[PDB]
Amino acid sequence: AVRRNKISLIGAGNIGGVMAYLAQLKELGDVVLFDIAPKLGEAKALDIMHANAIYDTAHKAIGTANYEDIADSDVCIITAGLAKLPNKKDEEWSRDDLVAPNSKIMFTIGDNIKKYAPNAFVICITNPLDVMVKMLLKATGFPKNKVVGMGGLLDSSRMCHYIADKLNVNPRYVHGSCIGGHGDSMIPLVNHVTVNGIPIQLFVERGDITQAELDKIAQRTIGSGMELVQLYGNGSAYFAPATAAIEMASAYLNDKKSVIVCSCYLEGEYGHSDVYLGTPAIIGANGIEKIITLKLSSEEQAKLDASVKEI
Amino acid sequence: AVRRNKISLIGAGNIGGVMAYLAQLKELGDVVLFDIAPKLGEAKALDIMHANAIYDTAHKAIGTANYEDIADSDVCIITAGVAPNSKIMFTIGDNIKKYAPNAFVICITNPLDVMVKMLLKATGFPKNKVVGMGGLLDSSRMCHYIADKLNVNPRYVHGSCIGGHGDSMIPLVNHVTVNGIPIQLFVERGDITQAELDKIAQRTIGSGMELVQLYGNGSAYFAPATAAIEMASAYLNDKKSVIVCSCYLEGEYGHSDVYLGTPAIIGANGIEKIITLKLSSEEQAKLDASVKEI
Amino acid sequence: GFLSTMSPAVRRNKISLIGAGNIGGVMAYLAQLKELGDVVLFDIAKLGEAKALDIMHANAIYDTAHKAIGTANYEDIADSDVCIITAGVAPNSKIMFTIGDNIKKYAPNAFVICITNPLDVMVKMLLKATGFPKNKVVGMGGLLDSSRMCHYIADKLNVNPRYVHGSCIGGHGDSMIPLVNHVTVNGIPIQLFVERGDITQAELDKIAQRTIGSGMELVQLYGNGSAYFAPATAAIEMASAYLNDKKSVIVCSCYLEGEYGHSDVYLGTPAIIGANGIEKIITLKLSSEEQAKLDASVKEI
Amino acid sequence: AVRRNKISLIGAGNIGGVMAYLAQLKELGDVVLFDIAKLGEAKALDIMHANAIYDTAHKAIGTANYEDIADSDVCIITAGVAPNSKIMFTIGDNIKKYAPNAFVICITNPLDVMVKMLLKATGFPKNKVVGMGLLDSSRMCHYIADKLNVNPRYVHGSCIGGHGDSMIPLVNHVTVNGIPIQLFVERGDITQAELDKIAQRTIGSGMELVQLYGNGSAYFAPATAAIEMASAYLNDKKSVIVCSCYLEGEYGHSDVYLGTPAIIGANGIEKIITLKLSSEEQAKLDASVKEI
């Protein structure tokens, strides 16, 4: 009759571990930590299982390197793929050199999902998001609504945090949308932010924040990734990306119909088609139940056309 | 050097019972179910205490009719209950003045914007420590009706219903937002009509009376109790939540010496700030007409 | 293309509440705030709509996403994963059939949790009316009775009740057997605390006697009506164990077919609740003096 | 009048990272990530982004200056024998100076030895210096719960003694919602020969994950444990937790930390619960105290 939700984390790196950790303490469902190094997933799995006993939670975490174990998964969250190039210096390679290898990686994962988890809600994190997700949509052959990219929730939440940290208010009430591509071409709609429905321009007229501080926030939102790549020294952000993915996986598993900015396959929205792109959407039991097409200005539309053409 | 949060509920009625229940399962702190009918508070305490053992929660709730038991309370929510009710507020606030001289006083009794003023004068506390519960109930009601129509998680539907907690409230429907997106966009896409948005404004005004006639006896209590606990949590935990509630004004909106529902930041200092919304002449007249009713 | 239909692969859990009384209202409240699933408040009377609309207002306050409705029509129970029943011996028994006949028609795959008293008698009337397997028709009582026993101990020991575990078995009534001498505190037998001086055997014996009359103790305290906050928490705690397949160890009224020497009678006993409802019945090793109190409980049932 | 809790973590490593994450998402209080290195600011900022997603209110900051520990309600230690013993004193001397009312929760290994160094450095009372017990005991209950296939929420157990190979997994005293584990042995769900091995696996669990991880050791469960302990102190839960406590006569020993059940509340160690042991179990405890 009923059964536990099954989430497969294709990639048990830094992001994968925190994702399993959160989902288990929230009892969102059983977790499969799939990694090409199986003991890495088995280590976090067993470790998180010891945490469940500490936290009195009932669900199970598994580690594996075999695609048979992600079978019947309701959600597949993908972080696998190349992130670094050890045998070359920082000067001999750019990010464009990993796109093609990662593209083939996205296919192998897609075929196995199509094989073992034909009904899975595929959330992708591997970057470049807007391109990598499109590789999964082809490989999985799933409908438009069951293949989503994670971003915009991370990008918008970062924008809303910087706003909240300045106003000294609970970020629960700072809403905002950062759209476009999940990269340096994103569009932080910082002047459309709202504080519990209150337009941000009000707080400008009050002196709580300044137009200059907003423009600088939009710029720090664009480089938040690299900012943390330089703070960590070795690696990138993972705590917040993990929380974003699990928040999207819960909106699906629980049919919350939450409004999240996600990378979505377009077929006419904003004047584009056949491309993934960050945009607010309604995530529910059918995945992307609805795309909210924002009313952009000519300047904001130009910025959107620019990131689409670099995707 | 650490201590449990203490929440006194002056009034163990239907609202009081749900408040103690939510606070005990959330482990928000100890609860004192104060009521002139001492047994009623004792019943729900022992019943909620049975819930704690089921739900594996550690805090304790008690029932009493002695103000000596609300001593050192961090929060005092009042549901006990115009002229005679006003007098009841002075007796409560005068005891809070003595036993709970540091409590964040939240008022539920109606008329809200008047009773809370009688608690402010009796307790002698500064204005930033005596707040009233309205607007958070009134705004969430509005946000629901819009979420239900849009079929969206109300988590992302924000809105402000200002004014007095009565028929003169001002549901700012046309300023509602969905994940920051203006509500007008959803009108321009067919998801909802301005006519339906105007209908939600009136339903919000009359939501209180709608449930009175649905219940047949009594009124709402699940949502009021839930809002009072959220306000009490933003204080105890210093969350600094933007919550619309009845605040004492000394100039804001052009009014003084009157309690009025406006968005504000609730933190460790109770009301740390008041957010004076930028109102149109259409909204000011509605506000000025609500102050006159108060 | 047929693997790419606009058909949802997941659903919200659906919990129907037959009886929107004081317990029904708290059950809908707790379930909604925990985002456990949609709730259907069913009652013969507006009473279910009032609590639903008021609890939906609470959802907007608490940023919770699930839905609650009121109704007086079994049609809104269809496809419910869980049916919890509080409406309500002879007249109650007949009421339990009508409910059971509709739960069979509309919610043929529901996990039926009974609360109406006499628990052990009403839940059996349900089992016969729905015709479901015995493992999907359970009665709530031992989790309430046991937790009450554990609170009285935790209250005297000044310990978190999260670590106080104990079993109260038998029938949901004066015949219940609260095994106070077997209570454990984070695995530690309570006898140790007796040796430490934190509690006396006399107090333990008296806690057993207070657990039995806890129902009436709150009736006199309430003056009008019985307890409801805890019976609601217990019920939702069990529905959550089913909807989430927690394999939770819960004392509850189960249909026995050999255990404890009895058969064809509902009797409270520790069990394991999961996606199959009652997945295992744990039979406790009873003493001679305890098997006697158990045999008396079945006689009264 | 009131105030956020101040939970400072001396050590922004893997364990320290999961701590801030769990504390922030649970809104248990403000978090401070201290470390010799940027390591704290990275996780503080990364976790601050997570707050905005999870709609949580509290704040986290990284730092490398003990001045940011001032007035900390809790100080959880993971930085790091003789060398790491000097660090405990350096750490303790700062907790003494900036957070003199802090509830100290040590994790650095050897637990029972490193925590005493903190006790003598901070100079705090007996009850305000604990050592994270809850990990070892919970590991035992997981393996039993995994075999029995029951919610570990209802499996209680106590793994007493030192936090090393000399620990005592009391696998035979385990209870399932108060039901003795022997009933499940007579039930067919498990065998005594399997419980004896669960004790061994519990002893070597810390080393099992070091080999699985390959690089470094466990951190998810160790982090969850100390946050539970810190939550039992800040919320005055008076919860029963197995943890390292400074003894003064208990079990026939004194002037030594040792893993034992205890009550944790607003006063830290509210009470030590001395378990009723046998001759075989006391000899193991005596063999552990000597190794500490």
Author numbering:
A (entry chain A): 12 to 322
B (entry chain B): 12 to 92, 110 to 322
C (entry chain C): 4 to 48, 50 to 92, 110 to 322
D (entry chain D): 12 to 48, 50 to 92, 110 to 161, 163 to 322
Text of the article:
The enzyme is serving as a terminase in anaerobic glycolysis pathway, which performs the reversible catalysis from pyruvate to lactate, with nicotinamide adenine dinucleotide (NAD+) and its reduced form (NADH) as coenzymes (Dando et al., 2001). Apicomplexan parasites rely on anaerobic metabolism to produce ATP for various biochemical processes, and these protozoal LDHs have been considered as ideal potential targets for diagnosis and drug screening (Piper et al., 1999; Dando et al., 2001; Al-Anouti et al., 2004; Cornillot et al., 2012; Witola et al., 2017). BoLDH is a tetrameric enzyme made of four identical subunits and displays 222 (D2) symmetry. Taken together, the studies indicate that Babesia spp. LDHs could serve as a potential drug target for the development of anti-babesial compounds.
The crystal structure of BoLDH apo form (residues Met1 to Gly330) was determined by molecular replacement method and refined to R work and R free factors of 0.236/0.268 using reflections to 2.67 Å resolution (resolution range, 44.11–2.67 Å). The BoLDH crystals belong to the space group P1 with the unit cell parameters a = 81.9, b = 92.3, and c = 109.9 (Å). Two tetramers were observed per asymmetric unit, and each monomer contains a co-factor binding site for the binding of NADH or NAD+ and a substrate binding site for the binding of pyruvate or lactate. As the active-site loop (residues 95–109) in open and disordered state, a poor electron density map for the loop was displayed. In addition, an extra insertion (position 101–105, —DEEWS—) is present in the active-site loop (β4–α3 loop) of BoLDH and creates a larger catalytic pocket than that of mammalian LDHs. Interestingly, the absence of this five-peptide insertion makes the BoLDH lose its catalytic function. An extension of ~15 residues at the N-terminal, named as N-terminal “arm”, was detected in the apo BoLDH structure, and each “arm” was involved in the formation of an extra salt bridge in the way that a proton transfers from the carboxyl group of residue Asp266 to the guanidine group of residue Arg15 at the interface of subunit A and subunit C or subunit B and subunit D. The results together suggest that the N-terminal “arm” structure is contributed to the quaternary stabilization of BoLDH but not an essential factor for the stabilization of R-state conformation. Interestingly, we found that the structure of apo BoLDH takes R state with the active-site loop (β4–α3 loop) open, and the feature is similar to other eukaryotic apo LDHs, such as PfLDH, HuLDH-A, and BmLDH, but obviously different from that of bacterial LDHs in R state with the active-site loop closed. Hence, BoLDH belongs to a group of non-allosteric L-LDHs.
